[PDB]
Amino acid sequence: AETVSFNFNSFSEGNPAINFQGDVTVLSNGNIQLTNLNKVNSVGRVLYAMPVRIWSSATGNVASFLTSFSFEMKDIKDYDPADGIIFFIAPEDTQIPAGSIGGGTLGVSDTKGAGHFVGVEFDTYSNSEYNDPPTDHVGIDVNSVDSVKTVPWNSVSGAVVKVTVIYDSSTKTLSVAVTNDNGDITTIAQVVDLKAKLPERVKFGFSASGSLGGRQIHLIRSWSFTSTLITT
Amino acid sequence: AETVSFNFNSFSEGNPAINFQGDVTVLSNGNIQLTNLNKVNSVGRVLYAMPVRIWSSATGNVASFLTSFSFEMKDIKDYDPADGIIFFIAPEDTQIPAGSIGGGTLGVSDTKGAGHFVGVEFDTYSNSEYNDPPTDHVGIDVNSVDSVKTVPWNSVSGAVVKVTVIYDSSTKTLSVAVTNDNGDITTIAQVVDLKAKLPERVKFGFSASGSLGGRQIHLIRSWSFTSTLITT
Amino acid sequence: AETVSFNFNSFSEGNPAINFQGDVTVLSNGNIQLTNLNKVNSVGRVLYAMPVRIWSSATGNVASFLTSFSFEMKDIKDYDPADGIIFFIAPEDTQIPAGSIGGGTLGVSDTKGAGHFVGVEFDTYSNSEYNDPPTDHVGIDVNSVDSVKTVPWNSVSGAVVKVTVIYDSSTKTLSVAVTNDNGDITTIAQVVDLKAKLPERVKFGFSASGSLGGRQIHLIRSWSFTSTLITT
Amino acid sequence: AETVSFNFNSFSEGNPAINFQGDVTVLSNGNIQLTNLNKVNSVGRVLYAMPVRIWSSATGNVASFLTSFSFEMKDIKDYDPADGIIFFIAPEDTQIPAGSIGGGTLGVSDTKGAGHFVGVEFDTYSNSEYNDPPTDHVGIDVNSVDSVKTVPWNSVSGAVVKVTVIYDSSTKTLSVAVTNDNGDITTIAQVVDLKAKLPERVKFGFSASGSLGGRQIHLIRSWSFTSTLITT
Ligand SMILES: [Ca+2]
Ligand SMILES: [Ca+2]
Ligand SMILES: [Ca+2]
Ligand SMILES: [Ca+2]
Ligand SMILES: [Mn+2]
Ligand SMILES: [Mn+2]
Ligand SMILES: [Mn+2]
Ligand SMILES: [Mn+2]
């Protein structure tokens, strides 16, 4: 039983348990603001500093993990509410794509929307070049922002959104449950073999981005995580 | 968007929001004691009073729900810890089987261990006649306590256990993440078409049962639930 | 090396190992409820029946001890939490102060908040008459609930708290580590010359109290204890 | 409220949370054997891979931590049982001192027995050059294997030893509670300003050394830890 577990009710600069990339910033109240409102094509990513072993090439086993986080997106006069936030898993050498154009790539893909990652996005701007549905949505991404699956969702400015994710290694199922301000929940699940798409050791994080005309406040308020690899 | 959501940090006799059945009692702190230790073959169930609609015959849609609860199981001199607790879903008229023999039936099945229900069991006693794994386990039960699927588990006497469940209607997947006292998680997932195994309107709840030589303390400490059915 | 060591994972009236004083009552799950919610200025105390020799006048040696225990405090409409629990050490003949007014005396002191004891209080209601801090707090008490030193704490209703106390006779240091539900730890330590404040033989126990308007549920879930006295 | 917490009931090579230094080896049963029996001056160290911030220069606050771990030492024919284990805290860049001669340096000090670290040793070999007591002992080391304080102890071969450490930030007290196989406890405590002796970011870990004629099996059976730094 190999278990990595952490809980964040707030954040602060200096904590060695978390890595910042790009235009990330910690607010006095302890929240993480992922993008910068004055930069064009902004990109902000926050990662748990320590890599986590999600599978052993020895036991062949794959870990299960339970994580939940709360975020908030808020409009600002008078740019378009873009582009959203993404909870991702990637190789430990994961950096903000070079020459990132931000926007629809969400800071995890190249200009074509390709990359090495597995994630859950909370997309609030429609990008046709990536085949986005016409409305706000939640999608499961596997090496591309061209979601492997999506579900209609509604991003309510200033609302605090609570998310719960469960990965069952046995069925290799990734289930997501989103709790909107109104109390309604949105779910989405997709079978993804983490052992076949990611390396033994990976990192977990949040990413968000904007464009020239599209910018909003992307806030990460809290994050608790727990993985458990069976060794034997 | 039809949603049902409730949250109990503690219970109490009376509250018409929860129908009791059997040897159920309420401790001083609001904890529910599903069974009685001075009674042979005891059964006790607790149900959310108001029935819930998990699917529509018109729309065809099945509801998605997110539920979490924390229970505790403690041993008693010198008796055997059995059998345990089951989170279940059944027809709005559900009742403790006629002539319930308690024990392995968990208060939801008959002698053969069959019944009209869906649920997750935290089985602590192994009944070979029900093809029970040799050790403590967690199982996805569909109309039978002879689990559709099980996973090795460890029940620790006196430890507060936390459970989170997510049912994604899009995939008909039922995900379970069990957080143990020591922080390790156990998961199990199973595709279960509720729409096919249950009526449009059901009731959610907990059930536990002891036998003659097998009795233990089963307590429910909290329960929050949210189901959402799309009506469009 | 004289060693006294015991473990209590569940309690049960009748056990000659425990002395019950006041309004104490054992729940059916094995928990000890210290206060009566239907009584004004209630007081309850549970004590290890066998007096423990912490020091000897013959050698001048003082014993070191290690002890851990878990409690649970929960609210009750619309009353105010009062007043909390206190782990205390005292003369083997200790009884509840005659004419106990309940309140912030925790059942170990008189109206002026004075008594003959040493303990760790987990104060939830602030009493200006006892120089209490404005918020919930943990404190080291020496013959008075007018703590020799307190520390900011946060009592969370329905939450299981873990405490570990270490007394080093060589330094006469009493150390307390409090594990909250969220995983945060709270500590407080202080030099207390036991040999100079209590008789050679004393009793160890917990006590809780409520008042007229302030009442809550105080539960002791477990308790393990080990002291070693050097004889040479 | 910043908090780091991990828990190991067993260990396995490959876990990125653990850093191995020296002759460290993981046994088939999940234990960590710190030294190499066929090697002269064998030195083995295991550290928690993630640096911990024990104090911020911003607020000037020191963290509090509660740790506990079980270890075991076993004699090997007919070599002398040496030298023991040390639980230490050093700079995040800490490495086995070049030209480490092992033995009484315990793998954290130079020839003179000096280095940059704070720790608790379980010394089973008297080294007059470092002023060790004539017998097995436990000591609080502050930048030197010439303990600032010791207490008589007794290493029993094959015996599992359970230790619990508490470091209260308010008093800057480091308290240790050692529970021997037979059930007797040994405590030692010392005031130590971790903010005056170490940098803001450090690493925790265990070290073990041997000599030419002094060798034995040093095992770390399990380790749990929780630090909490109040950033407010
Ligand atoms: Ca997009
Ligand atoms: Ca069974
Ligand atoms: Ca008070
Ligand atoms: Ca030595
Ligand atoms: Mn998209
Ligand atoms: Mn079963
Ligand atoms: Mn007080
Ligand atoms: Mn020494």
PDB file of N, CA, C and O in Angstrom, chain B residues 3 6 11 13 17 24 27 39 91 109-110 116 141 178 183 185 192 197-198 203 210 221 227:
ATOM      1  N   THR B   3     -33.427  18.165  -9.495  1.00  0.00           N
ATOM      2  CA  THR B   3     -32.435  17.763  -8.504  1.00  0.00           C
ATOM      3  C   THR B   3     -32.938  17.544  -7.079  1.00  0.00           C
ATOM      4  O   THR B   3     -33.799  18.258  -6.593  1.00  0.00           O
ATOM      5  N   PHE B   6     -29.777  16.507  -0.083  1.00  0.00           N
ATOM      6  CA  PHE B   6     -29.902  16.676   1.362  1.00  0.00           C
ATOM      7  C   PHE B   6     -28.573  16.428   2.076  1.00  0.00           C
ATOM      8  O   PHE B   6     -27.670  15.775   1.547  1.00  0.00           O
ATOM      9  N   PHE B  11     -28.459  12.829  13.014  1.00  0.00           N
ATOM     10  CA  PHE B  11     -29.846  12.455  12.846  1.00  0.00           C
ATOM     11  C   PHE B  11     -30.600  12.587  14.156  1.00  0.00           C
ATOM     12  O   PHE B  11     -30.106  13.188  15.111  1.00  0.00           O
ATOM     13  N   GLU B  13     -34.588  10.762  16.012  1.00  0.00           N
ATOM     14  CA  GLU B  13     -35.909  10.179  15.835  1.00  0.00           C
ATOM     15  C   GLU B  13     -36.855  11.327  15.516  1.00  0.00           C
ATOM     16  O   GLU B  13     -36.604  12.470  15.895  1.00  0.00           O
ATOM     17  N   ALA B  17     -37.965  13.132   7.590  1.00  0.00           N
ATOM     18  CA  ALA B  17     -37.127  13.094   6.397  1.00  0.00           C
ATOM     19  C   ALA B  17     -36.435  11.754   6.310  1.00  0.00           C
ATOM     20  O   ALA B  17     -35.821  11.426   5.289  1.00  0.00           O
ATOM     21  N   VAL B  24     -33.446  -0.057  14.588  1.00  0.00           N
ATOM     22  CA  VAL B  24     -32.680   1.172  14.509  1.00  0.00           C
ATOM     23  C   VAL B  24     -32.908   2.017  15.759  1.00  0.00           C
ATOM     24  O   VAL B  24     -33.979   1.973  16.357  1.00  0.00           O
ATOM     25  N   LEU B  27     -28.320   7.357  18.813  1.00  0.00           N
ATOM     26  CA  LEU B  27     -27.475   7.619  19.963  1.00  0.00           C
ATOM     27  C   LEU B  27     -27.592   9.083  20.337  1.00  0.00           C
ATOM     28  O   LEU B  27     -28.228   9.853  19.628  1.00  0.00           O
ATOM     29  N   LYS B  39     -30.287  -8.672  20.451  1.00  0.00           N
ATOM     30  CA  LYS B  39     -31.241  -9.438  19.651  1.00  0.00           C
ATOM     31  C   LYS B  39     -30.585 -10.374  18.648  1.00  0.00           C
ATOM     32  O   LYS B  39     -29.659  -9.986  17.946  1.00  0.00           O
ATOM     33  N   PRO B  91     -37.043   0.016  -4.507  1.00  0.00           N
ATOM     34  CA  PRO B  91     -38.369   0.552  -4.831  1.00  0.00           C
ATOM     35  C   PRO B  91     -38.924   1.321  -3.630  1.00  0.00           C
ATOM     36  O   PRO B  91     -38.676   0.946  -2.484  1.00  0.00           O
ATOM     37  N   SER B 109     -32.115  -8.802   1.682  1.00  0.00           N
ATOM     38  CA  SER B 109     -32.406  -9.984   0.877  1.00  0.00           C
ATOM     39  C   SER B 109     -33.141 -11.062   1.668  1.00  0.00           C
ATOM     40  O   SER B 109     -33.475 -10.870   2.838  1.00  0.00           O
ATOM     41  N   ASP B 110     -33.400 -12.187   1.010  1.00  0.00           N
ATOM     42  CA  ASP B 110     -34.082 -13.308   1.643  1.00  0.00           C
ATOM     43  C   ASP B 110     -33.066 -14.361   2.068  1.00  0.00           C
ATOM     44  O   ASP B 110     -31.892 -14.049   2.275  1.00  0.00           O
ATOM     45  N   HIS B 116     -34.923  -7.066  -4.567  1.00  0.00           N
ATOM     46  CA  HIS B 116     -35.045  -6.010  -5.564  1.00  0.00           C
ATOM     47  C   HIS B 116     -34.263  -4.798  -5.047  1.00  0.00           C
ATOM     48  O   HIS B 116     -34.820  -3.940  -4.359  1.00  0.00           O
ATOM     49  N   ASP B 141     -23.549  -4.719  -5.287  1.00  0.00           N
ATOM     50  CA  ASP B 141     -24.639  -5.678  -5.298  1.00  0.00           C
ATOM     51  C   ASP B 141     -25.804  -5.261  -6.160  1.00  0.00           C
ATOM     52  O   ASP B 141     -26.319  -4.144  -6.030  1.00  0.00           O
ATOM     53  N   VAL B 178     -13.381   4.384  -1.081  1.00  0.00           N
ATOM     54  CA  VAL B 178     -13.454   4.212   0.370  1.00  0.00           C
ATOM     55  C   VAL B 178     -12.169   4.748   1.009  1.00  0.00           C
ATOM     56  O   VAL B 178     -11.082   4.259   0.715  1.00  0.00           O
ATOM     57  N   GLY B 183      -5.881   6.752   5.999  1.00  0.00           N
ATOM     58  CA  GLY B 183      -5.707   7.543   4.799  1.00  0.00           C
ATOM     59  C   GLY B 183      -5.639   6.802   3.474  1.00  0.00           C
ATOM     60  O   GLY B 183      -5.649   7.436   2.426  1.00  0.00           O
ATOM     61  N   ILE B 185      -7.000   4.640   0.303  1.00  0.00           N
ATOM     62  CA  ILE B 185      -8.305   4.513  -0.344  1.00  0.00           C
ATOM     63  C   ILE B 185      -8.454   3.199  -1.086  1.00  0.00           C
ATOM     64  O   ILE B 185      -7.491   2.637  -1.612  1.00  0.00           O
ATOM     65  N   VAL B 192     -23.682  -0.248 -14.030  1.00  0.00           N
ATOM     66  CA  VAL B 192     -24.970  -0.757 -13.595  1.00  0.00           C
ATOM     67  C   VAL B 192     -26.090   0.112 -14.124  1.00  0.00           C
ATOM     68  O   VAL B 192     -26.228   1.273 -13.732  1.00  0.00           O
ATOM     69  N   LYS B 197     -32.738  -2.029 -13.746  1.00  0.00           N
ATOM     70  CA  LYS B 197     -32.853  -2.807 -12.528  1.00  0.00           C
ATOM     71  C   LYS B 197     -33.797  -2.213 -11.500  1.00  0.00           C
ATOM     72  O   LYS B 197     -34.098  -2.853 -10.493  1.00  0.00           O
ATOM     73  N   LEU B 198     -34.279  -0.999 -11.750  1.00  0.00           N
ATOM     74  CA  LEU B 198     -35.172  -0.345 -10.798  1.00  0.00           C
ATOM     75  C   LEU B 198     -36.295   0.471 -11.446  1.00  0.00           C
ATOM     76  O   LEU B 198     -36.241   0.793 -12.634  1.00  0.00           O
ATOM     77  N   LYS B 203     -35.880   4.740  -3.399  1.00  0.00           N
ATOM     78  CA  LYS B 203     -35.532   5.320  -2.103  1.00  0.00           C
ATOM     79  C   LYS B 203     -34.093   4.936  -1.750  1.00  0.00           C
ATOM     80  O   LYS B 203     -33.667   3.803  -1.992  1.00  0.00           O
ATOM     81  N   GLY B 210     -27.150  -8.464  11.974  1.00  0.00           N
ATOM     82  CA  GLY B 210     -26.287  -9.384  12.689  1.00  0.00           C
ATOM     83  C   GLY B 210     -26.957 -10.740  12.732  1.00  0.00           C
ATOM     84  O   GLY B 210     -28.109 -10.869  12.317  1.00  0.00           O
ATOM     85  N   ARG B 221     -22.732   8.122  10.710  1.00  0.00           N
ATOM     86  CA  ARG B 221     -22.474   9.402  11.341  1.00  0.00           C
ATOM     87  C   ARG B 221     -22.929  10.606  10.520  1.00  0.00           C
ATOM     88  O   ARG B 221     -23.276  11.645  11.088  1.00  0.00           O
ATOM     89  N   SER B 227     -28.886  14.209  -6.359  1.00  0.00           N
ATOM     90  CA  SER B 227     -29.178  13.521  -7.594  1.00  0.00           C
ATOM     91  C   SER B 227     -29.678  14.608  -8.516  1.00  0.00           C
ATOM     92  O   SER B 227     -30.260  15.593  -8.065  1.00  0.00           O
TER      93      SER B 227
END
